Amino acid sequence: SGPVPSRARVYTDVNTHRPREYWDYESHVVEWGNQDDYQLVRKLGRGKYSEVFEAINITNNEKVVVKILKPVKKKKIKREIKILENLRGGPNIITLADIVKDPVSRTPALVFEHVNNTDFKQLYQTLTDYDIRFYMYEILKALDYCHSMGIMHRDVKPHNVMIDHEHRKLRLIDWGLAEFYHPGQEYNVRVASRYFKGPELLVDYQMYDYSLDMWSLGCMLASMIFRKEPFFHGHDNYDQLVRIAKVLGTEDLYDYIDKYNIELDPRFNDILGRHSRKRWERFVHSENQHLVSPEALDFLDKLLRYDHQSRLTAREAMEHPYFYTVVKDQARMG
Numbered sequence: 001s002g003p004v005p006s007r008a009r010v011y012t013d014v015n016t017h018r019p020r021e022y023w024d025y026e027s028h029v030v031e032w033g034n035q036d037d038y039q040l041v042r043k044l045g046r047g048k049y050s051e052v053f054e055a056i057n058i059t060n061n062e063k064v065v066v067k068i069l070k071p072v073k074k075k076k077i078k079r080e081i082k083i084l085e086n087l088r089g090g091p092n093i094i095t096l097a098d099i100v101k102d103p104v105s106r107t108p109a110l111v112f113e114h115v116n117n118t119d120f121k122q123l124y125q126t127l128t129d130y131d132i133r134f135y136m137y138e139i140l141k142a143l144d145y146c147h148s149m150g151i152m153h154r155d156v157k158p159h160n161v162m163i164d165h166e167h168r169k170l171r172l173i174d175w176g177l178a179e180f181y182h183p184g185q186e187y188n189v190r191v192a193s194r195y196f197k198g199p200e201l202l203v204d205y206q207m208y209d210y211s212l213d214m215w216s217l218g219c220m221l222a223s224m225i226f227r228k229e230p231f232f233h234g235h236d237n238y239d240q241l242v243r244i245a246k247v248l249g250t251e252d253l254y255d256y257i258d259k260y261n262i263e264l265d266p267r268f269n270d271i272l273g274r275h276s277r278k279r280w281e282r283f284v285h286s287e288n289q290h291l292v293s294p295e296a297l298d299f300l301d302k303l304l305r306y307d308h309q310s311r312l313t314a315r316e317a318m319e320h321p322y323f324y325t326v327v328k329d330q331a332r333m334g
C-alpha cells in the first residue's frame, strides 16, 4: 500500500523523445554576455532566490530587467536558463535577453525584456469581466505552450504574471521553480507559493504533472472574479488544505486520497474536520457580481478539482465558452 502512480494526460512523453540535451540542463554550457553593457536603475524587489532591478543597456539605452541570482547550486541556475532558452519566443513567455556574471555578487545575473507592468494589487481592483477573460486566455496560451514543450512552471501566481495593461500585454515570468516532466518521476512537493499550492503538494503526492499549474490558475481566477486575493488564505501548508476543504468539501478530498492511496499526514486529523461542498454563489456579493457568470463558474469549477487528472488541460480550457468572445477578438485579419 504505497501511493498509486499517475501520469499526465497530455504531453506525457514529449521529453522522452527529445534529444537528451533539451532536458539535461546539468550539461548546459551557459552563453555569457558582457556585464558592462548594463547598469542597474532601481530595485524592484528581493526574495529567497534573487534581487531584481530595472536596468538599462547602456550601449543602446534600452530598458531591461536584471535578476541577480542569490548563491545556489550551478544546476539550479542551469535549469532556469535552459528552460528560458527552450521556451524563448513562445506565446506570452518572458524573453531572456542576456546572461552575465555580476561582479559585485559573484553570481550570474539574468537579463530580461522590460514589461511596463501595473502591480496586480492595484490592477486587479480595476479589471472588468472582459479583462479577466482576456488575461486568463493569455496565461493559458503560455501554459499550453510550456506544457507542450515538456515543462511545468510550478509557481503560477499574480506576482509571476506581468501585465502592461494599456497594451493588453502579458508575460509569464519567474521560471526558477520550473522543471521538465518525465513520466513516473517523483517530484519535490516544495514548489509554488502557499496560496497556489495544489492539493497534491499539500498531501505530499509526488508523482504530479502539468496539472499542478491548472490548480494555481484556478486559484487566480477565483481571486479575480470574486475580488478576494488570494482566494484560499491558509496560515501554513496544513491550514491551506483546510481552507480548500471548507470550499470543495471533505467528501471529495477523502475520495481523492482513497483513489491514490495517499497516506495523509496525521497532523491533518485534528484540523480538516467535516465540510460540505459549497456552491460558488456563496462567494458572490454586490462588489463582484458583475464579474461572475455561469460560464465563469463552470470554468472555475473544472480547474479547482482535487484530482489532478480531472482538471482541464490548458488546451481544453482555451475551448471553454467563457473565452468565446476573446477568441473571436483575437482572430485578426492583420
Ligand SMILES: O=C(O)c1cccnc1
Pocket: 052, 065, 067, 094, 112, 113, 173, 174, 175
Ligand atoms: O523571470 C523573472 O524572475 C523576471 C522576469 C522579468 C521581470 N522580473 C522578474
